[PDB]
């Protein structure tokens, strides 16, 4: 006898696609098990066969190999036991620190919450980077796209954001605590090894879950890896807490999914991607959400990554994830080598949530700074080609170059909100207007060490009062003008 309903046999195998005879009772996207131990997801249910994508090296799958159902729920472990563990696409540990002691589990493929379970994004998500928190502000629940060419600083923004959460997670306030999930799709292992070392060095791993589907892992593991990590973040969101997820990157995930769609012979569209590639990324990103009090009050915040090619933000996959997300942080190559680091384009970068994800301290100085940079960016094209310029434009050109230099920042040193507003305030009220533009980054680095060291009580005032008061205005005015004359000598 032969059971062709619950089991089947391989007709053809190649390029990680196994066509399977029988398997009449299998469901769509159901995980089946091959004879050699390897798993496989049933993506194409056709009349004469099942198109099964292979989860691993396909030399172990041959012709006439028995494919079996096991009623396998496609899920990954979730909880607080994953915190500080480096795991693969299915939540198996790859750090060699024993097993995961997980209790609960959640399906990788689930719908997002609808309209009713959410509430508007009120709680700010602090990155630590000044250009982001002031001009491109992100909120808990929001989905902010990090986008740019190769080697423009895309991951660095995600890393500093994770490192910035240590102060909240070490503090007593449970509302501000933000757990983190880094997801690596298509990267090499030595890059992820350096990335976990970076986080461990900053004591960040004790709250961070690292999901990693690397280049050697099969395409279906890269295809699932973002969804697996998304389910891990949803548990925190559902059970009251707040979460942050980084997809690094969705470009490489799309390539993995394209490989499967082309070898399953689904119709190739623009750039050879299938028609459901938007459906792919929109399913993922929509699951990040700000919940209301009734369902929990928690949140999941998405920071997806998209690698552009020659700055072409109009390319198919970038066009998708831009329109899905709530805002974009555009990184450019010309800005990076100009000295603008992080190399964020202020004019084009946007947060549609905006002020609603900011504190009153930041909201005071950010609106003023944003306006003056807009006045600069129009006039800046004839900054050098001017010379005989009137005092109106010379004020905008001077002030604008000063403020741009304050947006520059060091890597691996994310700042508290009270430290940022003090630095921006110096630019806005114009105490640095006569200082040499080239020496602002160095001026700021020493000034920051000075105000942290000596004036620790002054930073307490700005955080308590929720603004720079008239007392702080006068107190900070003395600290700048004296330091300015001492530094430039």
């Amino acid at each position: 006898s032969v059971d062709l309903e619950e089991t089947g046999r391989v007709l053809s195998i190649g390029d990680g696609i196994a066509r399977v005879h029988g398997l009449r009772n299998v469901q769509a996207e159901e995980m089946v098990e091959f004879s050699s131990g390897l798993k496989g997801m049933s993506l194409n249910l056709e009349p004469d066969n099942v198109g099964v994508v292979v989860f691993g090296n396909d030399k172990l799958i041959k012709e006439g190999d028995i494919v079996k159902r096991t009623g396998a729920i496609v899920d990954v472990p979730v909880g607080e036991e994953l915190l500080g563990r480096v795991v693969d696409a299915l939540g198996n540990a790859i750090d060699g620190k024993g097993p995961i002691g997980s209790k609960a589990r959640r399906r990788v493929g689930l719908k997002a919450p609808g309209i009713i379970p959410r509430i508007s994004v009120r709680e700010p998500m602090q990155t630590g980077i000044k250009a982001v928190d002031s001009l491109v502000p992100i909120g808990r629940g929001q989905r902010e796209l990090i986008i740019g060419d190769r080697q423009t600083g895309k991951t660095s923004i995600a890393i500093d954001t994770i490192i910035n959460q240590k102060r909240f997670n070490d503090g007593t306030d449970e509302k501000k605590k933000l757990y983190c999930i880094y997801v690596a799709i298509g990267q090499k292992r030595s890059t992820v090894a350096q990335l976990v070392k970076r986080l461990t060095d900053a004591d960040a791993m004790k709250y961070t879950i690292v999901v990693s589907a690397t280049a050697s892992d099969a395409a279906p593991l890269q295809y699932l890896a973002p969804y697996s990590g998304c389910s891990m973040g949803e548990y925190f969101r559902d059970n009251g807490k707040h979460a942050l997820i980084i997809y690094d990157d969705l470009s490489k995930q799309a390539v993995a999914y394209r490989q499967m769609s082309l070898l399953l012979r689904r119709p190739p569209g623009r750039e050879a991607y299938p028609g459901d590639v938007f459906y792919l990324h929109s399913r993922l990103l929509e699951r990040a959400a700000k919940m209301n009090d009734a369902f929990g009050g928690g949140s999941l915040t998405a920071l997806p990554v998209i690698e552009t090619q020659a700055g072409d933000v109009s390319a198919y996959i970038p066009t998708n994830v831009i329109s899905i997300t709530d805002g974009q942080i555009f990184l450019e190559t010309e800005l990076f080598y100009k000295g603008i680091r992080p190399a964020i384009n202020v004019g084009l970068s946007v947060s549609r949530v905006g002020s609603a994800a900011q504190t009153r301290a930041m909201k005071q100085v950010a609106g003023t700074m944003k306006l003056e940079l807009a006045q600069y960016r129009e006039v800046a094209a004839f900054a050098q080609f001017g010379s005989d310029l009137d005092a109106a434009t010379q004020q905008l050109l001077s002030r604008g170059v000063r403020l741009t230099e304050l947006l520059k920042q060091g890597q691996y040193s994310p700042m508290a909100i009270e430290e940022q507003v003090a630095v921006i305030y110096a630019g806005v009220r114009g105490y640095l207007d006569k200082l040499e533009p080239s020496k602002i980054t160095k001026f700021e680095n020493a000034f920051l060490s000075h105000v942290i060291s000596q004036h620790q009580a002054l930073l307490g005032k700005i955080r308590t009062d929720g603004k720079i008061s008239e007392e702080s205005d006068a107190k900070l005015k003395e600290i700048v003008t004296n330091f300015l004359a001492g530094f430039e000598a």
């Binding site: 299998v26 309209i115 509430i119 994004v121 119709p267 459901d276 929509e286 699951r287």
Partner: protein, 458 residues
């Protein structure tokens, strides 16, 4: 009768029948599902089998699962009970307030009005807004391109158009979220509640909401515009109203169509778009028109890909647009509300034959003097200095406080009728309020309040 699923590939389900096959565009209910799964028919493949496009996720489906022919297209609840309610592409309520208790069930796939039904009259939908009615007026049964991103009072402009058209013309509105961001679906719903255009406690709701969210498959976002269009077709045909249909976003209607066409195996056209791009647009847009019963005017959110107007998506859509409403950040940052660019925003019905003679000449003077001001900003004589004072006052008088933004701002909202807008800007160009100061014109209803503001502050 009950047909069997013979293939499932992503969101493309093949269904075999025996006795009688369903026609194209028919809705098929899948039996043995917890949530409702509609499959819209697309192609008769042959040998008693049809190809369908699924309106929801196909995970869990087995080969041989029971699929029942409804015997018609996707039929959805229509009536006055839809006002104040949110429904999906297939008519189900997604606001969690129970079933939508209407006494009619209209099909979403409906033929456009015949040539005999067409209204040759070039009427003008009086919006109430000063920037719109003067310079870029909305034609009845026409389409308008709503340009500019979010954060410039886009959702506020929508709500006021719902508010003002429901008051004067007695016509309700419809919002079709074609690829709605579920977060922004939440924000638009609750902002409409707090303003007053939606009412949760009594039945004074001025909008029906129809969301086809981004996480739904291509079949959903493709047809959700037709669902909301059908809700508007009830108010026009059955009750003779001049209806509004807000589509956001029209590029996502084009995009969803390009996804569906790809999934079915059709070979793409130029720039990757579906070969049926003009027809997919045309079959939708021709229903948005005037008839003898009433009209369906439509504000449509235009996204221009790659900032290229000559791209297939915008080019094909501009064939249908009768006007444009260009929102701007440069206009917003100068304190003007609404944030409409007066020179960029234009209309086809802006014509001395169509609208009034006094309408066309006065509006032409505003278009002339505002450009003359923009020339002088680069830098005067008696005529040059006189135009600079008037043009600034024209920029102030274009601003208006909205009824939607009362709890938002504090200032009272004012609906300005048509001829008040003609007379107001005419007296400024003629030079009757050259004596009065500039700040009186900022944030006012008609010109009577500007004079009343000058009489009080004196």
């Amino acid at each position: 009768t009950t047909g069997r699923i013979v293939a499932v590939i992503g969101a493309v389900v093949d269904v075999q029948f025996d006795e009688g096959l369903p026609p194209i565009l028919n809705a098929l209910e899948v039996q043995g599902r917890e949530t409702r799964l509609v499959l819209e028919v697309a192609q008769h493949l042959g040998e008693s089998t049809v190809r369908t496009i699924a309106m929801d996720g196909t995970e869990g489906l087995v080969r041989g699962q029971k699929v029942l022919d409804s015997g018609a297209p996707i039929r959805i609840p229509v009536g006055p009970e839809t006002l104040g309610r949110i429904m999906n592409v297939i008519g189900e309520p997604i606001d969690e307030r129970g079933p939508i208790k209407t006494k009619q069930f209209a099909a979403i796939h409906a033929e456009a009005p015949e040539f005999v039904e067409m209204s040759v009259e070039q009427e003008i939908l009086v919006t109430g807004i000063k920037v719109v009615d003067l310079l870029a007026p909305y034609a009845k049964g026409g389409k308008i391109g709503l340009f500019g991103g979010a954060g410039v009072g886009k959702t506020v402009l929508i709500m006021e158009l719902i508010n003002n058209v429901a008051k004067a013309h007695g016509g309700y509105s419809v919002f079709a979220g074609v690829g709605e961001r579920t977060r922004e679906g939440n924000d638009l719903y609750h902002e409409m509640i707090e303003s007053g255009v939606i009412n949760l406690k009594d039945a004074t709701s001025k909008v029906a909401l129809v969301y086809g969210q981004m996480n739904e498959p291509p079949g959903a976002r493709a047809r959700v515009a037709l669902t909301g269009l059908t809700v508007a077709e009830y108010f026009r045909d059955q009750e003779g109203q001049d209806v509004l249909l807000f589509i956001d976003n029209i590029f996502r209607f084009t995009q969803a169509g390009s996804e569906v066409s790809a999934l079915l195996g059709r070979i793409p056209s130029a720039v990757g778009y579906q070969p049926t791009l003009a027809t997919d647009m045309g079959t939708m847009q021709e229903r948005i028109t005037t008839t003898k019963k009433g009209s369906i005017t439509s504000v449509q959110a235009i996204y221009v890909p790659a900032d290229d107007l000559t791209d297939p998506a915008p080019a094909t859509t501009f064939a249908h647009l009768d006007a444009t409403t260009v929102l701007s950040r440069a206009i917003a940052e100068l304190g003007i509300y609404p944030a409409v660019d007066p020179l960029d925003s234009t209309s086809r019905i802006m014509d001395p034959n169509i609208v009034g003679s006094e309408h066309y000449d006065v509006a032409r003077g505003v278009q002339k003097i505002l450009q003359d001001y923009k020339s002088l900003q680069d830098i005067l004589s008696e005529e040059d200095k006189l135009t600079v004072s008037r043009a600034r006052k024209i920029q102030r008088f274009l601003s208006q406080p909205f009824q939607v933004a009362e709890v938002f701002t504090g200032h009272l909202g004012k609906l300005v009728p048509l001829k008040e807008t003609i007379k107001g800007f005419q007296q400024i160009l003629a030079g009757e309020y050259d004596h009065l100061p500039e700040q009186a014109f900022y944030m006012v209803g008609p010109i009577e309040e500007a004079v009343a503001k000058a009489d009080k502050l004196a």
